[PDB]
Scaffold this active site. Structure first.
Site, PDB file in Angstrom:
ATOM      1  N   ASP A  34       8.233  10.238  39.298  1.00  0.00           N
ATOM      2  CA  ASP A  34       9.451  10.160  38.510  1.00  0.00           C
ATOM      3  C   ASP A  34       9.679  11.483  37.810  1.00  0.00           C
ATOM      4  OD1 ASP A  34       7.107   8.471  38.058  1.00  0.00           O
ATOM      5  OD2 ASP A  34       8.532   6.815  37.989  1.00  0.00           O
TER       6      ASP A  34
HETATM    7  O1  LIG Z   1       4.693  10.167  39.536  1.00  0.00           O
HETATM    8  C1  LIG Z   1       3.592   9.588  40.141  1.00  0.00           C
HETATM    9  C2  LIG Z   1       3.636   8.167  39.665  1.00  0.00           C
HETATM   10  O2  LIG Z   1       3.845   8.255  38.304  1.00  0.00           O
HETATM   11  C3  LIG Z   1       4.373   7.102  37.678  1.00  0.00           C
HETATM   12  O3  LIG Z   1       5.337   7.484  36.717  1.00  0.00           O
HETATM   13  C4  LIG Z   1       4.791   8.001  35.520  1.00  0.00           C
HETATM   14  C5  LIG Z   1       3.757   9.083  35.769  1.00  0.00           C
HETATM   15  O4  LIG Z   1       2.485   8.571  36.029  1.00  0.00           O
HETATM   16  C6  LIG Z   1       3.672  10.100  34.641  1.00  0.00           C
HETATM   17  O5  LIG Z   1       2.944  11.242  35.006  1.00  0.00           O
HETATM   18  C7  LIG Z   1       5.015  10.452  34.054  1.00  0.00           C
HETATM   19  O6  LIG Z   1       4.771  11.352  33.035  1.00  0.00           O
HETATM   20  O7  LIG Z   1       5.553   9.293  33.546  1.00  0.00           O
HETATM   21  C8  LIG Z   1       5.916   8.371  34.529  1.00  0.00           C
HETATM   22  C9  LIG Z   1       6.408   7.141  33.789  1.00  0.00           C
HETATM   23  O8  LIG Z   1       6.992   6.217  34.642  1.00  0.00           O
HETATM   24  C10 LIG Z   1       5.022   6.007  38.508  1.00  0.00           C
HETATM   25  O9  LIG Z   1       4.514   4.748  38.193  1.00  0.00           O
HETATM   26  C11 LIG Z   1       4.941   6.155  40.009  1.00  0.00           C
HETATM   27  O10 LIG Z   1       6.084   5.644  40.565  1.00  0.00           O
HETATM   28  C12 LIG Z   1       4.782   7.575  40.388  1.00  0.00           C
HETATM   29  O11 LIG Z   1       4.629   7.708  41.761  1.00  0.00           O
END
Ligand SMILES: OC[C@H]1O[C@@H](O[C@H]2[C@H](O)[C@@H](O)[C@H](O)O[C@@H]2CO)[C@H](O)[C@@H](O)[C@@H]1O
Ligand SMILES: OC[C@H]1O[C@@H](O[C@H]2[C@H](O)[C@@H](O)[C@H](O)O[C@@H]2CO)[C@H](O)[C@@H](O)[C@@H]1O
Lengths: 822, 822
Positions: free
Chosen positions: B490
């Protein structure tokens, strides 16, 4: 119990010990950057908004409650202690905390050394300034090393408090020990992001050390009172990538007996334009122009001392426009000083932040402020005029009104409830007052927009209209106005009906349909209907000042026919048309609100207080018989033993608590003027000293709170901890109680056409001198009280005798004598 | 550094000291009520959901981090100490904590007394059970009094943590010291409200004391480690109206040397039907039928011990369906035990709760779980089948998919971002796998509804279609699919462009319009396009299994023409059509994700690994040259020094952190099978032991985290605390890494038509025996590894030699021999 006293002459509340029952705090800063400081130095700071720009980190629901504030760590040859006592909670020789107007003092003494701090946010500076005066009181030499502590909040509470996945990796900060004037730090987390701003922490001495990571500063397996660096005798000079960052500077002071040193800190919401954001084309260093200056004007004791006065005067000027001389100091300090003060915090706080407000969910309320303005128009009309327009702008072209608004972005919030059908009339209540204070019919012609949406702006008058006619449109088969989500208090939700947990009663969904009505509203609108029918008339909209005038009466008349119990007013006609607050129920027959509010508006009021054939009278007699407590008047009675599905959040509360058989201060001051309105002066006062904290000093332990502030919620007769007051500091009671004495008890109350002197103080107070600045002319009202119920004052203005409650408005620079006997 | 070791034979991780770097926890309970317990006993408990039903209170961002868990206070003649060490942090003679499968053990020893606790949430019981074994190891007599502590969370985190105005007045609880089997308490806050449930805390001995208010228990000016009642030598037997309530029971034990006593506690999410809610017609006492029983089945050590096994077996059975025998214990423990375990927590946790998850904002993700199912279908197909349908139901008839869903209410959430254009294809990824595991084409014909809205239900197949065709509709001028709010991660938001703080990048508004595209998606859809074109074919929808089949190729072919850099795949074509992740930028030329994900899908893959004219090869060569770290492969390189307005949240992160040049474990396992896919077995493994915690035991201090779990985020080469891993325990890496060894490294990977044995483990592992239960038949795969890059195994099934990667599915109760040499 008692833990301090009032020092009027100094305009301040003094505290003996840190062993207060609950943390007692003061509010620093009246303009753009306020800080909250517990007498323990515990608390935190923010710019404009605390939901979004929380300069620094506080943790509610803490064990013990409130470890963590601005702290100074002191090492005396391996001896670490803090005058805040907290956090190290050490054995103190002597200790004391004095709250002030815009400031507080904390002074602590252990093992032959004295540390005193002055806390204040000064005017024009969006920074909390701190002036320390470590003084040595020993025959021997003390050679000390001093650690200053602070824990930054990553600018955002909702995100910071709650969202650690992204959060622990963004915490980059910069250090500059060799700053022009001493040595400092610059929390800049997220600044590489959209932020164009940050915060600055400093001291004015070249720091011989520092630290910018908490764990580094304190080390693991640790508490605050067990900080690791302060004990090591120097600083680990941490520097932060990620995690929680703090600011510290290593300082040593050496002082002959009685010798002393001065140390000034400077925590500031520093901020730049975008263009000059960067000291680089790299954009990897923070522009520090606007912060060098900051710590630059505050780099001597001469300037820090110099500032201390500036604001002192600021308040000092400020109290003039209304003051008193009497026998009842108890009275005096609260009107004069401490209440007019408590009034101010609210203008600015709305109900956003307190120590019971996490100040995340709550920005500023439409309803809490409109009512908040009353208490404040006289402090500062100019500042006030804007709020009217800032708050009015959260007004739907519907007439329907944004329950509240996000302080900082100045925009409406649906975050917390929606569809409160009384809001709309508030606008008139606070607003109509503006003018009384000033005569400024200018504000009506100001153009106020709808929903902040441009191109829609209309003179503020349409905002008065819209809301007036919102009701007229929105009322029930009785001709009574509709409650919707709620009248006033949000605990009365007829159209909710909900058995599934996890949804607040204010966000939860509200069912389409109803024949449901509030009598509290109807009441208000009979006060404000006229509030605007008149202002509209002085408009020369005579034809529509009558229509409006008329709609009150249909409503005046429908509030006795249909909301009357022959003893009290009906709380409401619920969802299918059945009533609420009749004598016809086991629980909750009498609800205080239509009662106080329908008598202030004047409904069912007879010849005198002697006459008991007046619903006014029957209505108050009863709250007297039923609701009234030694500590104040519980919202209604009796409270609930079971959950009224149809009503909403009201019964969720155990008996004796809050909107459920709890003393709702706020509701109380409405009734008093009802006593005054009615002429039962003696009773009202008894009420006012009843829910009043001037008179709070008595059992500091019953309250567990600040003896100087109107706290919503003092627990109920029904509850075990009755006399338990919570949520002190941010109750409309601050604004509504000042009102009463301001205008109805000490009866110095304004109008569009003159100043109205009409006291009703009961015999307790037989003499006073009220000096009120109106329209530039000072009014010196020396009065003689003898207390006849239904007694009234006759006026003798400037030596000559006159008729009316009224004094003609006097040309500025003029000083005028009013003598009234009653 | 090291703080414990693995005890495979016991299936558990052992810990030497409480002086671990960061709190290391285990997850208890696999069905409906899970608890989280730090090896310090710190942590908390919840039913189904923790946002809403947080049985008990934990406080993140605590000083020190994590004071406050389930604690036992012990007084030995005025001596108060806790084996959790925390909170009192006392001097311990001996200490140790062993994590388990569904449980953990904490054992502490000070001053001649031994206290050992067994922590576990057992099967069928929505309660965390605790079995204590205070044993005395002294020649002399010890006469002790024991205090048990717990701090209830008023059922709701968002409301509890943050909303104190209503909250401090609702905390009524009930006590019953004379319970059938011992003495207990019943947090019932809000129960008078819509709640029909509560929690029960008990011990099985008549308690000679108790307490239900925290301050009362600890007194003011206090910390947890300075609790006030434990030191007084008895209990104040508080009872609570309002504020924060806890549970305690006063217990004394007297024991000859070596003598010992057994004490069982029972904390339970007790709950009733509405009708039988009340023991009164008053409705003022809580029905305790369903709780008497609770503490009733757990009232001896015989039952507590009896239960301990039940689950042990539960796991014990559970690991069978996939296991291994080899030389690399490092490997073995992780596949066999600890990884297959870490896989499970996720099935249940989604990413809701961890010690980095406040588990308020986060329920269960569409994308995190679909990917989570892969790791789990083989643990329990039956349980899994439902998720598919539980998660699929958060599917818009649009095809567009609810980014996530509220675990408990089982309903979609817009709370955290929306419009993630890759989600839709996930459904196919996890789902298609179901069937491979089972052959259950039944689930396609299950009817799955849209948005939870009734009457809409369609066979789950339309949910496969909808999502397949969502892409086909939604793609850019290159024939590449659109990124929208984001592809996968994201942090890549092309259409955001935002300079105003206070709005998360996931909630923040997303601008209408674009020519913007993701190559990561395109990649996935080339994997899943076929995933469904086939399943649809076995449907006999042959005509539409080709259309679908075709749309992949336009897309297969458009992912090399348009997303190729002659060295690596383009990260994306941003908003106005310009690319991202070209060699043509200073920063961020190579992004790991299309890379790993486009090779798993097979794009640009040549004859062998020898051939370097294969984009497959060029593509990985480079991540090797650029991204690859000793600790794992950073998301892309190099990370950012400046905030890419156009991109979104990506650059907000300092270099080296997270989605910004941080090692994103999750991204890593995608590439490995790319190595395997490619035949570079030796490389992949090197990668897999690279980001792998089996091999984590080495420098426990670099990590600061649990050596047994896949933690998202291990810090980057660019960052100072590189090798810093955060957010351990809840990363799809748990699910995606098991996968790799499950299926691609140890190459025991299923299909619709047979079991596929195809190892590629590099020479490091020359021999293993994999036993996998498939379709009721056990497959014993003894294998001989010699490691030729591009080597492959030839199969000799049941003594006879065969062709294919493939083994025919074998009739149940049958046992089958596979020998493969490579
Ligand atoms: O982006 C990889 C994984 O991350 C998830 O979103 C999170 C993420 O872990 C974090 O680094 C960012 O700062 O915040 C977002 C909050 O949603 C997400 O669950 C996955 O879809 C995504 O592939
Ligand atoms: O109801 C009186 C006053 O209360 C405010 O709403 C609060 C209230 O203080 C509290 O007791 C209840 O539990 O929660 C609600 C939250 O909004 C409100 O600001 C006023 O409008 C209202 O008159």
């Amino acid at each position: 119990m008692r833990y301090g006293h009032f020092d009027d002459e100094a305009r301040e509340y003094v505290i003996t010990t840190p062993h207060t029952p609950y943390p007692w705090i003061n509010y620093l800063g009246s303009e753009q950057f306020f800080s909250l400081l517990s007498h323990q130095a515990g608390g935190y700071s923010f710019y404009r908004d605390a939901k979004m720009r929380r300069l620094t980190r506080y943790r509610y629901n803490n064990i013990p409650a409130d470890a963590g504030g601005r702290y100074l760590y002191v090492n005396d040859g391996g001896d670490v202690w803090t005058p805040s006592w907290l956090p190290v909670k050490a054995d103190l020789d002597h200790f004391e905390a004095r709250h002030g107007l815009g400031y507080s003092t904390i002074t602590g003494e252990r093992n032959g050394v004295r540390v005193e701090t002055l806390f204040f946010v000064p005017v024009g500076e969006n920074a909390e300034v701190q002036k320390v005066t470590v003084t040595n009181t020993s025959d021997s030499y003390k050679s000390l090393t001093l650690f200053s502590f602070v824990e930054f909040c990553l600018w955002n509470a909702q995100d910071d408090q709650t969202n650690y996945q992204r959060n622990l990796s963004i915490g980059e900060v910069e250090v500059e020990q060799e700053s022009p004037h001493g040595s400092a730090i610059y929390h800049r987390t997220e600044y590489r992001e959209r932020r164009d701003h940050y915060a600055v922490f400093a001291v004015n001495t070249q720091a011989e050390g520092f630290d910018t990571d908490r764990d580094t500063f304190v080390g693991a397996y640790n508490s605050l009172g067990e900080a690791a660096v302060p004990l090591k005798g120097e600083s680990a000079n941490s520097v932060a990538s990620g995690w929680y960052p703090i600011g510290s500077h290593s300082v040593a002071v050496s002082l002959a007996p009685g010798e002393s040193r001065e140390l000034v800190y400077v925590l500031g919401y520093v901020e730049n334009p975008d263009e000059e954001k960067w000291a680089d084309d790299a954009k990897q260093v923070v522009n520090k122009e606007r912060a060098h200056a900051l710590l630059s004007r505050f780099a001597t004791s001469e300037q820090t001392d110099a500032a201390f006065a500036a604001l002192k005067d600021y308040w000092t000027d400020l109290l003039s426009t209304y003051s008193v001389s009497s026998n009842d100091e108890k009275l005096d300090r609260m009107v004069n000083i401490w209440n007019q003060y408590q009034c101010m915090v609210t203008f600015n706080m709305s109900r956003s932040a307190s120590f019971f407000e996490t100040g995340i969910g709550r920005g500023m309320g439409f309803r809490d402020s409109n009512q908040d303005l009353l208490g404040f128009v006289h402090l500062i009309p100019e500042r006030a005029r804007e709020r009217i327009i800032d708050i009015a702008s959260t007004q739907f072209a519907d007439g329907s009104a944004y329950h509240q608004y996000q302080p900082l972005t100045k925009r409406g919030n649906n975050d917390i409830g929606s569809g409160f059908n009384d809001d709309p009339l508030w606008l008139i209540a606070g607003t109509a007052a503006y003018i009384k204070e000033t005569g400024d019919f200018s504000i009506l012609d100001e153009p106020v927009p709808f929903d902040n949406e441009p191109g829609s702006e209309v003179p503020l008058f349409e905002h008065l209209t819209r809301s007036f006619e919102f009701t007229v449109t929105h009322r029930g088969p009785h001709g009574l106005p509709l409650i919707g989500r709620a009248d006033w208090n949000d605990c009365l939700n007829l159209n909710c009906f909900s058995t599934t947990p996890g949804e607040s009663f204010q966000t939860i969904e509200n069912q389409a349909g109803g024949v449901a009505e509030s009598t509290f509203i109807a009441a208000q609108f009979v006060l404000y209907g006229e509030q605007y029918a008149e202002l509209a008339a002085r408009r020369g909209l005579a034809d529509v000042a009558d229509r409006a005038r008329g709609h009150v009466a249909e409503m005046r008349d429908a509030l006795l026919t249909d909301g009357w119990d022959g003893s009290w007013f009906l709380r409401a006609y619920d969802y299918y048309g059945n009533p609420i607050g009749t004598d016809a129920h086991d629980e909750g027959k009498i609800w205080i609100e239509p009662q106080g509010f329908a008598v202030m508006a004047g409904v069912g009021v007879g010849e005198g207080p002697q006459d008991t054939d007046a619903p006014a009278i029957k209505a108050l007699d009863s709250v007297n018989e039923m609701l009234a407590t030694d500590h104040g008047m519980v919202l209604q009675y009796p409270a609930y033993t079971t959950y009224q599905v149809h009503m909403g959040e009201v019964s969720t509360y155990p008996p004796g608590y809050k909107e459920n058989g709890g003393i709702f201060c706020h509701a109380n001051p409405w009734v008093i003027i009802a006593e005054t309105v009615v002429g039962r002066g003696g009773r009202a006062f008894d009420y006012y000293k009843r829910i009043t904290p001037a008179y709070r000093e008595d059992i500091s332990d019953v309250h567990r709170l600040e003896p100087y502030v109107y706290a919503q919620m003092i627990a109920g007769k029904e509850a075990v901890r009755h006399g338990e007051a919570k949520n002190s500091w941010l109750t409309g009671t601050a604004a509504w109680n000042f009102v009463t004495v301001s205008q109805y008890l000490l009866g110095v109350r304004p109008e569009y056409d003159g100043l109205v002197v009409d006291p009703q103080i009961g015999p307790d107070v037989p003499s006073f001198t009220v000096t009120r600045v109106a329209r530039g002319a000072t009014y010196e009202i020396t009065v003689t009280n003898s207390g006849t119920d239904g007694s009234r004052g006759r006026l003798v203005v400037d030596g000559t005798p006159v008729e009316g409650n009224l004094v003609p408005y006097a040309p500025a620079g003029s000083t005028v004598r009013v003598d009234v006997t009653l």
